[PDB]
Design a protein around this ligand. Structure first.
Ligand SMILES: [Mg+2]
Ligand SMILES: [Mg+2]
Ligand SMILES: [Mg+2]
Ligand SMILES: [Mg+2]
Ligand SMILES: [Mg+2]
Ligand SMILES: [Mg+2]
Ligand SMILES: [Mg+2]
Ligand SMILES: [Mg+2]
Ligand SMILES: [Mg+2]
Ligand SMILES: [Mg+2]
Ligand SMILES: [Mg+2]
Ligand SMILES: [Mg+2]
Ligand SMILES: [Mg+2]
Ligand SMILES: [Mg+2]
Ligand SMILES: [Mg+2]
Lengths: 51, 206, 149, 144, 179, 97, 32, 122
RNA sequence: ACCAAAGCUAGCUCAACAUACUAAACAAAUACAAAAAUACACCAAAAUAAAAUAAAACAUUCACCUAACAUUAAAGUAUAGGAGAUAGAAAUUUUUAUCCUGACGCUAUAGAGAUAGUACCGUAAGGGAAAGAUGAAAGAAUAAAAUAAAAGUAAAAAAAAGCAAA
């Protein structure tokens, strides 16, 4: 007569086990783009001109 | 601290005392035993930090540094080589930061590479004449070093600065001992000049 | 000292001395209001009033006026997945009172750095800005915004 | 083709979530027809991480293009744009490569859109944007 | 003298408070008796402080600053203990030659188990002692049966532990036949 | 009555493994061997069962006579009870009399 | 494979330990 | 059905049941019924002056550990009695009857802290 | 489409051998009301096993039934027995080493009661459970993968008349 349900799933961000990582996360890439080239405002009208 | 694991247990690369683990395998979990090829600790030729070649998987013929070994399941981790992709940051509106992550390898799919010609080789434990135990290559006939590696603390002994409650190397290694036949009690009581006269009456033991 | 044998006392015996004491002590913040005279410790189960008074005065040089103690019963009620009971261990609490009119107060051990809290609010504002950046354009209607055209 | 394995060799970790995510339950048909102006290299940048001694070469290639894009909805009914229009695009495409890495892949890192960029072609379906949801005691306020 | 229960106020709100390694036994075998006696109190005060900080961390729902210290300190004290004990147990082996600091005997109790009975100190000799006299170290004859059962039970357990291990070897040999 | 949905790993038995290849080798040891050892000697088994046979009652009765004093209490008791049962049953019960 | 060595009956005289309690009392007799 | 498993404690019984938690008795009941404390049974902490000395609860990390040699009765015999014994046998003054000059103690009952019945707690 | 369904492991069984046979762990506390350092005593002991049952009842009798002597025969013979049921010898005979240990034993309602003598039930002696299943990795949960097959239901109430079908 006594039995209960299980499995209530949760996501808990907690900094302590995140620090205790024994093999720190290896990244192939960096998320941002350092310096963003900001192009000429007339770049549509200089495209029809080759040289 | 020593956490005692249940007799039947699976090893998920997650540190057995951690929330990732308690969440993966809760108090009452008993799963099917994964058959593991028994290896005596003296037959184990793979440590952390040594360059190795991968014989299997989608990434093969490559070479990488071993980060972590899991001995209970016979596993190696070659950083950023054996790979599958996983999101880390999460909230309801935001799935953040897809990160490449490493799937572990059996020790059959990874061979140790000797430094000189950068080929994969069969390592065999040998005793030399100096009382030393080193790994010797079967194919190339050379000895392979052992991978000196940092430690879990992230504390390098060479660069260090003593805080208030740290004792200096000088005072720690200093030998004050005069190996004489009195106990701690007699020594200290004599040194503090505490003077006691009376003696204990007879006691019966049983 | 605890867990150790003590020599039987008969009449006209030497004074009993403990050279390296076994005990250990927690200074804890009170759960209820207390007069400034009063400090409150958690001690090992086996430590007597007299013991703790001597302990404080000798090791720490604290002028003890009076000491009272009680034993707190830890709950046996919580159950295991096996339905076995778990016992939060019982412990001894010691109220001490300082002699020379000395007032104590339990110090705040976790004052927050305002620069780390401002960096936390700025990282929360930056995170909310990223989650507002990634959020879909209402007017696109669910067409993926990667493609130039 | 929706082949993700090759897509993990080509594009970077920052790009992949973006170009794959939204589109996974839909059908994409994308074709390359012309490149009007041959691809130009605008700039190059390096990020020096003193921790890892790791350097990432980042190359921005500006390119002008002729592309045909058609996105179909999961029921197979057209959603975004025609398959017959060779539409002209201008994209500023950032590339990245890890250097210290011995396997040294050249990858597609990101896509930058200019502030003056031409408004993208309109959607097919009609879309509604709701006003602020009001509790009972909260009165509405209209800005001008 | 109440502040020795707390770290220097310079440390209070800080996440990481760094610290040295715990004492090895070896470094302690070099120190004299007096210096060990002192080091015991230096270690005591610090262990107390650390425990205080521990509980106070639980109270505030916050993680404890650099928890590891508490481990280290303990080991040190523990290590220190192991050393001093050595010098006693060596010493008495010289003087008396008994391996055990407490007088004791091998006895057989009511239940027929062979027990190590530690002795106790009494003001009166053993035959004049009511309470001690009413313990029984010896077994009655019926107990002999139970003794047998014990053995057999034990034997079984060992017997089928052995058989298990044997089995585990065979399985593996057909799973990994690299021989 | 639900039947298993996945094909089991096909078990390959090689019949040329050592034990199967050498089977029944010394069985003729008496005849070809100028009789010295009877084939009984080849039989590896429980001490009371080597080169002998019988119905369950006889079997039990024999086990008790040979190893009955090396037995564990529980097992000896069980054996006695089994014997008594089998005795009563064989002797006093059945169709055929 | 090659078969085990054939089981043979040793024709040497066989004397059991008179001092070993695990030895049967029929093999200790004069008759034996 | 009461409670079998939970341990027996003074909190559980009647008024008449008082069972200590294992602290040690400091005295006896006197004449008036009032309790008398014996100053000798109350442990006296022996605490050294820590102020003028240099040692700390932790050790520098680059400071070396050492080869681990557990002290044995033998090594202790060699560091103490062996130099003196060799010195007085080489001089022919060695007396197998009285070894007491070297630090050997024939019997334990004279001295304050005895080793075998173990008179002291710590 | 729900409820569900499928794994093969945990371990077990029976023998062999074997040294020899009360495991492990003991700092303190444990025979005050076990786990409570400390005061003049007492302490200890044995007597045939019985009956259910068989004899178609039951009265003498009724193998085995917590006492080492095995094996092949003598032999179910001599004997003993309300001379009924049944019980039942001996003299005298036979027995060649050690290695080749495992399995036409079980696979989660099986095999141990056993994930455990735990939960729970009894004042107590005592009784005594049930329960596991993803993958190389879940440090791959906008998660990926092969049954969708029991009864029970839903998708879909019923329409004169009758062992419900033929
Ligand atoms: Mg009180
Ligand atoms: Mg009960
Ligand atoms: Mg009470
Ligand atoms: Mg009450
Ligand atoms: Mg008083
Ligand atoms: Mg009858
Ligand atoms: Mg009948
Ligand atoms: Mg009748
Ligand atoms: Mg009878
Ligand atoms: Mg007659
Ligand atoms: Mg009759
Ligand atoms: Mg079962
Ligand atoms: Mg069962
Ligand atoms: Mg159905
Ligand atoms: Mg009809």
């Amino acid at each position: 007569s006594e039995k209960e349900f299980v499995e209530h799933a949760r996501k808990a961000g907690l900094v302590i086990p995140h620090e205790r990582l024994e093999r720190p996360i290896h990244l192939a890439c960096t998320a941002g783009i350092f310096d963003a080239y900001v192009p000429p405002e007339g770049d549509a009208r200089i495209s029809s001109l080759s040289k | 601290s020593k956490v005692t694991l249940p007799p039947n247990y699976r090893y998920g690369m997650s540190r057995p005392g951690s929330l990732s683990d308690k969440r993966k395998n809760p108090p009452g979990t008993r799963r099917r035993r994964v058959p593991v090829e028994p290896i005596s600790d003296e037959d184990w030729h793979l440590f952390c930090g040594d360059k190795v070649e991968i014989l299997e998987g989608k990434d093969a013929g490559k070479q990488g540094k071993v980060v972590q070994v899991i001995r209970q399941r016979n596993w190696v981790v070659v950083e950023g080589l054996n790979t599958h992709y996983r999101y880390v940051g999460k909230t309801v509106d935001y799935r953040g930061t897809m990160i490449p992550s490493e799937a572990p390898l059996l020790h059959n799919q990874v061979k140790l590479v000797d430094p000189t010609d950068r080929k994969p080789t069969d390592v065999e434990w040998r005793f030399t004449e100096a009382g030393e135990r080193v790994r010797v290559s079967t194919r190339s006939g050379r000895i392979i070093p052992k991978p000196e590696f940092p430690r879990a603390d992230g504390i390098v002994p060479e660069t260090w600065i003593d805080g208030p409650k740290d004792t200096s190397v000088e005072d720690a290694l200093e030998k004050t001992y005069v190996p004489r036949l009195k106990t701690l009690e007699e020594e200290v009581m004599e040194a503090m000049g505490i003077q006691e006269t009376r003696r204990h009456k007879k006691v019966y033991w049983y | 000292a605890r867990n150790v044998l003590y020599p039987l006392y008969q009449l006209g015996n030497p004074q009993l001395r403990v050279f390296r004491t076994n005990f250990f002590i927690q200074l804890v913040r009170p759960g209820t209001a207390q007069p400034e005279d009063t400090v409150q410790f958690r001690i090992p189960m086996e430590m007597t009033r007299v013991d703790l008074r001597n302990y404080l005065e000798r090791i720490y040089n604290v002028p003890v006026a009076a000491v009272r103690t009680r034993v707190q019963y830890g709950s046996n009620r919580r159950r295991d997945h096996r339905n076995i009971r778990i016992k939060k261990p019982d412990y001894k609490v010691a109220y001490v009172q300082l002699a020379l009119g000395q007032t104590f107060t339990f110090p705040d051990l976790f004052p927050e750095r305002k620069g780390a809290s401002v960096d936390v609010d700025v990282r929360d504002q930056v995170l909310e800005d990223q989650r507002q950046k990634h959020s879909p354009d209402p007017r696109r209607g669910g067409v993926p915004g990667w493609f130039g055209l | 083709n929706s082949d993700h394995d090759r897509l993990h060799t080509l594009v970077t970790e920052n790009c992949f979530p973006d170009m794959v995510w939204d589109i996974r339950y839909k059908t994409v048909r994308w074709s390359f027809v012309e490149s009007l102006e041959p691809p130009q290299v605008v700039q190059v940048r390096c990020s020096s991480l003193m921790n890892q001694g790791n350097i990432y070469g980042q190359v921005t290639v500006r390119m002008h293009t002729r592309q045909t894009l058609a996105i179909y909805d999961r029921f197979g009914r057209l959603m975004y744009g025609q398959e017959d229009v060779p539409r002209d695009v201008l994209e500023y495409v950032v590339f990245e490569k890890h250097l210290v890495d011995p396997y040294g892949s050249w990858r597609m890192h990101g896509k930058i859109i200019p502030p003056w960029a031409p408004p993208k072609q309109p959607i097919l379906k009609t879309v509604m944007i709701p006003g602020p949801q009001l509790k009972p005691w909260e009165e509405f306020e209209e800005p001008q | 003298g109440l502040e020795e229960f707390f770290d220097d106020p310079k440390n209070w709100g800080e996440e990481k408070v760094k610290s040295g390694a715990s004492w090895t036994c070896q470094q302690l075998r070099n120190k004299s008796n007096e210096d060990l006696h002192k080091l015991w109190y230096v270690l005591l005060k610090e262990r107390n402080m650390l425990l205080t900080l521990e509980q106070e961390a639980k109270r505030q729902r916050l993680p404890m600053p650099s928890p590891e210290r508490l481990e280290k300190v303990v080991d040190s004290m523990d290590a220190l203990d192991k050393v001093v004990q050595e010098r006693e147990d060596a010493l008495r082996l010289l003087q008396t030659g008994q391996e055990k600091a407490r007088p004791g005997a091998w006895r057989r109790d009511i239940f027929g188990r062979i027990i190590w009975h530690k002795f106790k100190q009494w003001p009166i000799p053993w035959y004049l002692n009511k309470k001690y006299n009413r313990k029984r170290f010896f077994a009655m004859p019926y107990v002999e049966r139970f003794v047998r059962m014990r053995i057999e039970k034990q034997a079984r357990i060992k017997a089928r532990k052995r058989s298990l291990e044997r089995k585990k070897e065979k399985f593996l040999q057909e799973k990994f036949p690299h021989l | 009555f639900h039947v298993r949905v996945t094909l089991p790993p096909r078990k390959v038995v090689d019949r040329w493994n050592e034990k199967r290849a050498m089977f029944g080798v010394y069985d003729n040891i008496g005849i070809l061997g100028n009789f010295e050892k009877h084939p009984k000697e080849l039989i590896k088994g429980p001490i009371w069962l080597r080169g002998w046979k019988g119905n369950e009652l006889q079997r039990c009765i024999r086990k008790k006579r040979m190893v009955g004093n090396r037995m564990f209490i529980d097992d000896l008791h069980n054996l006695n009870k089994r014997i008594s049962y089998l005795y009563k049953h064989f002797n006093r019960h059945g169709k055929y009399r | 494979y090659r078969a085990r060595p054939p089981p043979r009956r040793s024709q040497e005289p066989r004397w059991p330990d008179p001092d070993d309690p695990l030895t049967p009392r029929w093999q200790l007799s004069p008759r034996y | 059905g009461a409670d079998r498993m939970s341990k027996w404690t003074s909190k559980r019984g009647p008024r008449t049941f008082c069972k200590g938690r294992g602290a040690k008795g400091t005295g006896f009941h006197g004449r008036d019924g009032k309790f008398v404390q014996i100053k000798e049974m109350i442990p006296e902490l022996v605490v050294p002056e820590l102020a003028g000395f240099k040692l700390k609860p932790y050790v520098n990390y680059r400071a070396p550990e050492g080869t681990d040699t557990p002290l044995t009765a033998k090594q202790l015999f060699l560091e103490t009695a062996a130099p003196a014994i060799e010195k007085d046998f080489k001089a022919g003054t060695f007396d197998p009857e009285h070894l007491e000059k070297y630090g050997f103690e024939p019997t334990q009952e004279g001295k304050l802290f005895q080793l075998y019945p173990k008179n002291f707690p710590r």
